[PDB]
């Protein structure tokens, strides 16, 4: 007998096909059957008429490394229909690193003494012993490796340092990591050469992981940054993932036509993937960057002056008698929101066939960017339904079947008999992002229920208490 059957709704199976009326039966952690299940014995038959039953959403780009440990409920994500998170992005992973004051942007994951894992396996063991509500597919970050090995980060690494990082990377992959990420855009790795990155990531071909990256530059020199990424992919002969694709700065608006053309061409000869979030503003560490600081900038958190959280940097700078760029040093470490993208580009990038959906949420921020709470429903509601950017089945595919395939998450991302029971029940007519820049933590509308490995984790707009997540392997 099945444990339960979700009956009377429309199934959008995650393979990018129009929805069809069908029931979904679950037994244990597996989807036992799909179709007319009136003839199958079940302990419960849940009515989901008027709703859509789809695979659970996979967040391709998260910074939930530590949040998974400190807030197992994972409300910001499960309330949106997310059932699996990919961690350790942009070169930033919680482990391996025992440091009491990690350099920005590593501090985006810190709640105070959070970096206590000497080995990557110790981190994975912790997750398994006290599982979060969602599954976790973890990557190790290059900048974290640099911080753990190099006494001085403002220079290229020596052969001995490269060997040390490569050993740590290898141990992480052997322990279960699904890949390695880099973020040469940031201070900790700005001095890292392309060859340093290649040598540190060589274990990928032996273990079969992916290479993810926050490119060295996403503005004036984005073409060069794209080429470096493609080159790294060919040298390693491993798939590459371009994180949160965008063209930032007024002088780069409209250039998504150009960048997408380059990516499409690369996909013809090598393995390339990419993800993005549905907003015109970015967010990360407060940084002395003239392009990032060109437009409206809001503080998310500030260590030396906590009261600045939520304020407009222009006011702060002006009142201190300095430019936004010159006032940054005295306010660090801190975080911010940067309005430096244009709607047309965001829409073009989201619509681009292979683009997967990733939130890039920064969960520890005092006053966070709303993407943390509304990314997925904003794509299903605002963009798919209201603007008609793509049909619903395609919008779902972009956060389920496509993502599972690119990260190698076997038996997930599809509503198919035999696959794991990560599922979402939502109302297509009302699903929508409620979070706004003004009120960034509002819960999404239209999300009826969410299941992970067969257990309901979100019901009646609340965490059920089921710590059903598992550490996944590629
Ligand atoms: Cu990131
Ligand atoms: Zn990034």
Ligand 1 centroid–CA 90 distance in Å is 5
Task: List the resolution, Å.
Answer: 1.8
Phi, psi of 101 (to 5 degrees): -150, 65
Sign of CA dihedral 232, 235, 236, 239: positive
- Report the separation in Å between the CA atom of 242 and the middle of ligand 2, taken as the mean of its atom positions: 10
Q: Which of 401, 391, 388 is nearest to 357 (CA)?
A: 401
Residues of the chain with CATH 2.30.40.10: 1-54+414-427+446-464
Q: How far is the CA of 319 from the centre of ligand 2 (A)?
A: 30
- Widest pairwise Cα distance in the chain: 75
Residues in the chain: 474
Quote the ligand 2 centre to 322 CA distance (angstroms).
28
Q: How far is the CA of 348 from the centre of ligand 1 (A)?
A: 21
Name residue 302's beta-bridge partners.
334
Q: Where are the beta strands (DSSP E) in 291-350?
A: 297-302, 334-338
* Helices 343-351 and 256-267: angle between axes, nearest 10 degrees: 20
DSSP letter at 420 equals B
89 alpha carbon to ligand 2 midpoint, in Å?
A: 7
HSE-up of 92 (CA within 13 Å, CB side)?
28
CATH-assigned architecture of domain 1-54+414-427+446-464: Roll (2.30)
Give the number of the ligand closest to the Cα of residue 359.
1
Range(s) of the chain covered by CATH 3.20.20.140: 55-281+339-408
CATH 3.30.1490.130 segments of the chain? 282-338
Q: Does domain 282-338 have CATH number 3.40.50.720?
A: no
Q: Ligand 2 centroid vs 81 CA: distance in angstroms? A: 23
> Which ligand has the nearest atom to the CA of 61?
1
Q: What technique determined this structure?
A: X-ray
Q: How far is the CA of 183 from the centre of ligand 2 (A)?
A: 7
Q: Which bin fits 141, alpha (ψ -120 to 50), beta or left (φ > 0)?
A: beta
- The tokens for 454 are 């067969």
322 Cα to the center of ligand 1, angstroms: 30
Strand partners, 11: 20, 53
Q: Could you give the angle at which helices 120-129 and 159-175 cross, rounded to 10 degrees? A: 20
User: Cβ distance 115 to 106 under 8 Å?
Assistant: yes
Per the CB < 8 A criterion, the answer to whether 343 and 281 are in contact is no
Measured from the alpha carbon of residue 214, the closest ligand is 2
The CATH architecture assigned to 55-281+339-408 reads Alpha-Beta Barrel (3.20)
Give dist(CA 56, CA 269) in Å, integer: 31
Q: How far is the CA of 399 from the centre of ligand 2 (A)?
A: 19
Spatial strand order of the sheet with 455-459 comes to 20-21, 10-11, 52-55, 423-426, 447-452, 455-459, 462-463
CA of 292 to the centre of ligand 2 (A): 13
Q: How far apart are CA 87 and CA 362, in angstroms?
A: 12
Span from the CA of 35 to the centroid of ligand 2 (angstroms): 41
Return the ligand number nearest the Cα of 109. 1
């Amino acid at each position: 007998p099945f444990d339960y059957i979700l009956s009377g709704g429309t199934v959008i199976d995650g393979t990018n096909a129009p929805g069809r009326l069908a029931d979904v039966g679950v037994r244990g952690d597996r989807i036992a059957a799909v179709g007319d299940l009136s003839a199958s014995s079940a302990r419960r038959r849940i009515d989901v008429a008027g709703k859509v039953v789809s695979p659970g959403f996979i967040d391709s780009h998260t910074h939930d490394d530590n949040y998974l440990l400190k807030h197992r409920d994972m409300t910001p994500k499960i309330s949106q229909g997310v059932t699996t998170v990919v961690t350790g992005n942009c070169g930033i992973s919680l482990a391996p690193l025992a440091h009491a004051n990690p350099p920005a942007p590593l501090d985006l994951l810190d709640e105070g003494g959070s970096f206590r894992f000497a080995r990557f396996s110790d981190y994975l063991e912790a997750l398994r012993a006290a599982p979060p509500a969602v599954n976790a597919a973890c990557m190790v970050g290059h900048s974290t490796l640099r911080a753990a090995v190099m006494p001085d980060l403002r220079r290229e690494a020596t052969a001995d340092e490269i060997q040390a990082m490569q050993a740590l990377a290898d141990d992480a992959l052997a322990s279960g990591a699904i890949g390695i990420s880099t973020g040469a855009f940031y201070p900790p790795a700005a001095h890292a050469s392309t060859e340093e990155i290649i040598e540190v990531c060589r274990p990928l071909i032996t273990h079969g992981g992916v290479y993810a990256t926050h490119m060295r530059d996403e503005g004036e020199h984005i073409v060069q940054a794209l080429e470096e990424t493609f080159r790294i992919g060919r040298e390693l002969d491993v798939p590459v993932v371009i994180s949160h694709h965008k063209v930032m700065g007024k002088l780069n608006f409209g250039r998504s036509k150009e960048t997408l053309a380059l990516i499409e061409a690369a996909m013809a000869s090598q393995d390339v993937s990419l993800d993005a979030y549905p907003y015109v503003a970015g967010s990360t560490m407060l940084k002395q960057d003239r392009v990032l600081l060109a437009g409206r900038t809001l503080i998310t958190w500030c260590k030396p002056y906590p009261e600045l959280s939520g304020r407009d940097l222009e006011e702060i700078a002006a009142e201190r008698g300095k430019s936004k760029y010159d006032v940054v040093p005295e306010l660090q470490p801190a975080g911010a929101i940067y309005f430096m993208m244009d709607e047309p580009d965001v829409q073009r990038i989201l619509a681009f066939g292979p683009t997967m959906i990733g939130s890039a949420g920064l969960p520890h921020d005092e006053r966070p960017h709303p993407r943390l709470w509304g990314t997925f429903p904003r794509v299903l509601g605002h963009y798919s339904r209201d603007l008609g950017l793509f049909p619903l089945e395609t919008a779902v595919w972009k956060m389920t079947g496509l993502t599972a395939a690119k990260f190698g998450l076997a038996e997930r991302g599809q509503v198919q008999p035999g696959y794991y029971a990560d599922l979402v029940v939502f109302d297509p007519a009302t699903v929508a992002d409620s979070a706004t820049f003004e009120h960034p933590t509002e819960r999404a509308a239209g999300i009826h229920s969410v299941y992970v490995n067969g257990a309901a984790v979100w019901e009646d707009q609340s965490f059920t208490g089921q710590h059903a997540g598992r550490v996944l392997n590629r």
